[PDB]
Design a binder for these strands. Structure first.
Lengths: 141, 84, 185, 181, 50, 99, 35
RNA sequence: CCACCAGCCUACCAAACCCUGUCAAACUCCGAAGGGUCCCAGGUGGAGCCUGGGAGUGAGGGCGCGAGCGAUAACGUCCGCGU
RNA sequence: AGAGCGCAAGGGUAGAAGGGGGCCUGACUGCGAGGCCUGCAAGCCGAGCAGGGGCGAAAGCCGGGCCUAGUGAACCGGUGGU
RNA sequence: UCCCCCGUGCCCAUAGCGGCGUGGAACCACCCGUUCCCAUUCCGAACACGGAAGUGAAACGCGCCAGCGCCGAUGGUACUGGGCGGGCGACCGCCUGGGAGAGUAGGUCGGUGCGGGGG
């Protein structure tokens, strides 16, 4: 989780999400990484779920970084209502993530550690991902 | 069915869009009293027989044809030059 | 080390790509022809390179010339190289990223702690007569909270610097556990 | 010209010491005196009219000139006064006028200050400027008890063509400014 | 609003007209502004009536 | 610092681009657009006299004739820091009609 | 300084506590103080 | 731990700034594809212009992509270009 | 140019629209070329012309306000005049 | 024909900053006097009116440097007319033409006409 505590617009329109990551597939941080495969929102609930499952499995572990950040307002209408009359509610605080975007990375772990960890952490999220090392990513800032 | 407490709004209010834009360009004869630039701030500064009014609007003073100009450390220019 | 090269003509990349050749451009001072290589040995060799090591491209033109890399645009989608830039070398003081090899196991390290990999690759002005290989970086006496930066690093006699030097090249950071489940609060 | 005591001495004494020790092989770059403004801005002009500025003009009356009631700038709720027209008493002194100013100053003004320990040395701007305040208005010669209300200090400002510490400092010591230590 | 209200000035030397507005709230005692009538050049003008 | 183009409030029509400086008075009359000038008259930069105010007088009137040789009738005294103390040559009698 | 209602000038002395005799030129005619 | 006033220290909080990446309909340094309109040119078609009598028509719907809304549900509704 | 530019924000502005002083009163009169806009109606822009008026040494600006909100056709009747 | 400067204007920062070197013989600028013209919500600073001695630092004019600042090719890609499949959608692919900024190379502290004086 995490988000602004006071931004600019309570509500904002859904939008269209096709692809291209916009920017963010290299590193400069971790030594292993987890990268998305589909153009969807990732919910901060799921995000912190991953953060958990991660630091959870590997206790006393080093530092993990989240390149993403859940800053998209979901419009959730009250339950059992009728059409029109308004909109949703500032629920589902999430982020816009497209394939090829490094959601999150580990550094200081172990090989199989980072493996199983990021493996499960990714298995949590509403998609599927790529577990990546660090070599080609070099340069691009 | 059961439809409990819902609500309302406050935003069903819009400003009547007023047709704004530039009407005449280089290549068109404009003869004395023809508006050719609708704007709010100085998007287009007047000049050579060009005119401005009480609301930043460019028009024709002569029976001349429009043309443009760029002067960075001054602004954007329109010059409606006629014939010798 | 060694790698093949061939002159690009101007044929649309789409084909060159879809076959097996990796398209790219090379240049020096004013020269700017177009070229291409071959993914597999290109990939394999580049691992033993980047802007850390020097490369050589032999060409069926009668001339074999070495370059360094630079700017690598990618596919984003499905993640992999799809274009490369190669700056032809010289002997006149050039600027690029020398690797910093982390060395030292102090108090930040060992007693928990994780190194802050900021700048392995750092902007330096070295004469292409000299070639700094693996600039050592002293970690031998650092503790969590602190860092290391500036001229503290190794400045080989044939290499000059020009970044800040302020820029923290590395630091040590605190680990995590179930104590952030207390933060969960 | 208006020959006072420290003026004639500046003419003469300044050239030997300044040119010999500091070394200034330029007849006109040589950074000497400059503008000396006196400023007594309060903030108590919440109102009380210019019966409160009448006090402010009495100040300029002592320097031998008439002032301008420069003022504030913004809306301050805390100590009242918004917009920006209260009390920021100011006058501009130059050449032969500031001459008589500092004249009366180091001649007779300064010694009766009560905590006249030593002219504060740590108030250097560093570009040929020197800024300081004071605790009593009557420390200067001309004004005696027959006008005083309670307390009305002054923030003296003296810019100099100088640019560094040493030159303007010893300029103050060649125009009589007895520092702390 | 009436506080600013609406009043009309008239020339002296018989009648004449021109239309205006006031501000009684603002220090507006009486008005004798200088304008031009239908007949002849610019002259006097006095304020009167609603 | 006196720009404002007072020359824009002189873009009205026909210019007299000048400037005053310590020793010389640069009284010039300029055809604009192409910025092609015409009529110059100066202090001792015209080799006339040494006091700007007297020079002015004489110069303007000398300048008058110059203007009146090239079919010149009216322009506008050009300066932002002008202040206008006249220098009652004020290029008014000096050809222009001026004031 | 110019104007007109300016508080004027005129010389002033100094009959200090030591016997000092300084010659000043400020605003009030009778200036004298301490040292 | 002192006063004429300062020192000093931290796996604390944080103004700002530098770097590391980063996000945006109501952010915009750059800015297309495109549309728009004048100028010259071709284009003979139930093109077009101009005045004049007769209408009807004003619940429309689907698919197509581009946006809203819905839950990036609806053989859902809401607009736009396209049929 | 992040200040301010009455009020909401947009656009705009320090080569002024902002802020200081002096004379004033063009929130002028009789007309309006030709254009914005558009179902009608209403709204928007203004050259020039002539009467005279204010400031400007002049060249010259002035038919209210930096603009977009502050509005109500007609029928009825009040009131002063022709 | 051109050299140095002054008045000036055009390009719109590759024209700007900063560091630096140089000129006062005509100039420019400080300077100089504050009686006269004249003005400052206060200042002869500013605008001035009258100008001998001096100065070339500051004002500026010319020169050298890129550190900052501005420009930015060329490869490739984004997105896209128009055409055509594939997927339950979320969405992906191909041709035809159109073609960015991101950045790398590298560029750049100037370009220039009217008028005036001295040589």
């Amino acid at each position: 989780m995490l988000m602004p505590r006071r931004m600019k617009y309570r509500k904002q329109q859904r939008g269209r999400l096709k692809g291209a990551t916009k920017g963010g597939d290299y590193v400069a941080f971790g030594d292993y990484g987890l990268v998305a495969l589909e153009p969807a929102w990732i919910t901060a609930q799921q995000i912190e779920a991953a953060r958990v499952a991660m630091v959870r499995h590997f206790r006393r572990g080093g530092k993990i970084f989240i390149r993403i950040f859940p800053d998209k307002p979901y419009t959730k209408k009250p339950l059992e209502v009728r059409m029109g009359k308004g909109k949703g509610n500032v629920e589902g605080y999430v982020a816009v993530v497209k394939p090829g975007r490094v959601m999150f990375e580990v550094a200081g772990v172990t090989e199989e550690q980072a493996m199983e960890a990021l493996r499960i952490a990714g298995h949590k999220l509403p998609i599927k991902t790529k577990i990546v090392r660090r070599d080609a990513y070099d340069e691009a800032q | 069915a059961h439809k409990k407490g819902l609500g309302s709004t406050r935003n069903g209010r819009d400003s009547q869009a007023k047709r704004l834009g530039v009407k005449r360009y280089e290549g068109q004869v404009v003869r004395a009293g023809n508006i050719l630039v609708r704007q709010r701030g100085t998007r287009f500064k007047p000049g050579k027989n060009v005119g401005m009014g009480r609301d930043f609007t460019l028009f024709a003073l002569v029976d001349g044809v429009v043309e443009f100009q760029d002067r960075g450390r001054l602004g954007r220019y329109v010059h409606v030059r006629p014939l010798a | 080390y060694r790698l093949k090269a061939y002159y690009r003509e101007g044929e649309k990349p789409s084909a060159l790509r879809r076959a097996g050749k990796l398209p790219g451009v090379m240049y020096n001072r004013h020269l700017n022809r177009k070229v291409y290589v071959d993914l597999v040995e290109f990939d394999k060799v580049f691992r033993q390179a980047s802007i850390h090591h020097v490369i050589v491209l032999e060409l069926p033109d009668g001339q074999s010339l070495p370059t360094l890399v630079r700017q690598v645009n990618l596919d984003k989608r499905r993640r992999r190289p799809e274009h490369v830039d190669f700056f032809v070398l010289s002997d006149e003081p050039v600027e690029m990223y020398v690797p910093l090899r982390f060395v030292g196991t102090p108090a930040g390290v060992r007693a928990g702690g994780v190194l802050q990999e900021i700048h392995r690759d750092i902007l330096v002005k070295v004469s292409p007569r000299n070639i700094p290989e693996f600039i050592e970086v002293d970690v031998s006496g650092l503790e969590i909270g602190d860092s290391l930066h500036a001229s503290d690093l190794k400045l080989p006699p044939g290499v000059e610097l020009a970044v800040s030097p302020e820029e923290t090249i590395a630091a040590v950071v605190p680990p995590e556990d179930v104590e952030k489940l207390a933060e969960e609060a | 010209p208006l020959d006072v005591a420290l003026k004639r001495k500046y003419y003469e004494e300044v050239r030997p010491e300044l040119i010999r020790r500091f070394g200034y092989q330029n007849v006109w770059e040589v950074p000497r005196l400059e503008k000396v403004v006196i400023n007594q801005g309060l903030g108590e002009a919440k109102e009380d009219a210019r019966i409160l500025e009448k006090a402010a003009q009495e100040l300029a009356l002592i320097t031998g000139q008439k002032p301008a009631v420069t003022r504030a700038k913004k809306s301050i709720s805390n100590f009242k006064l918004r917009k920006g027209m209260p009390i920021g008493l100011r006058v501009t002194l130059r050449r032969d006028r500031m001459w008589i100013f500092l004249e009366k100053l180091l001649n007779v003004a300064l010694p009766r200050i009560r905590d006249f320990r030593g002219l504060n040395p740590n108030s250097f701007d560093g570009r040929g400027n020197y800024n300081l305040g004071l605790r009593e208005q009557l420390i200067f010669p001309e004004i005696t008890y027959d006008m005083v209300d309670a307390l009305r200090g002054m923030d003296i400002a003296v810019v100099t063509t100088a640019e560094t510490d040493e030159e303007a400092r010893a300029l103050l010591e060649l125009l009589g400014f007895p520092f702390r230590k | 609003v009436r506080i600013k209200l609406l009043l009309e000035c008239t020339e002296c030397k018989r009648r004449n007209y021109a239309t205006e507005k006031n501000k009684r709230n603002t220090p507006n005692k009486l008005e004798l502004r200088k304008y031009c009538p239908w007949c002849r050049k610019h002259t006097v003008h006095r304020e009167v009536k609603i | 610092k006196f720009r404002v183009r007072n020359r824009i409030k002189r873009t009205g029509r026909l210019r007299l681009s000048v400037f005053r400086s310590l020793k010389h008075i640069y009284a010039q009359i300029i055809d604009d657009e192409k910025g092609v000038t015409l009529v110059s008259a100066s202090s001792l930069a015209l080799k006339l006299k040494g006091n700007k105010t007297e020079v002015a007088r004489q110069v303007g009137r000398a300048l008058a004739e110059k203007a009146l040789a090239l079919g010149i009738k009216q322009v506008a005294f050009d300066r932002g820091p002008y202040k206008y103390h006249g220098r009652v040559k004020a290029l008014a009698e000096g050809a222009r009609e001026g004031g | 300084m110019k104007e007109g209602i300016h508080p004027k000038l005129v010389p002033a002395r100094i009959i200090c506590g030591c016997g000092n005799v300084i010659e000043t030129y400020s605003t009030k005619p009778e200036i004298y103080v301490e040292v």
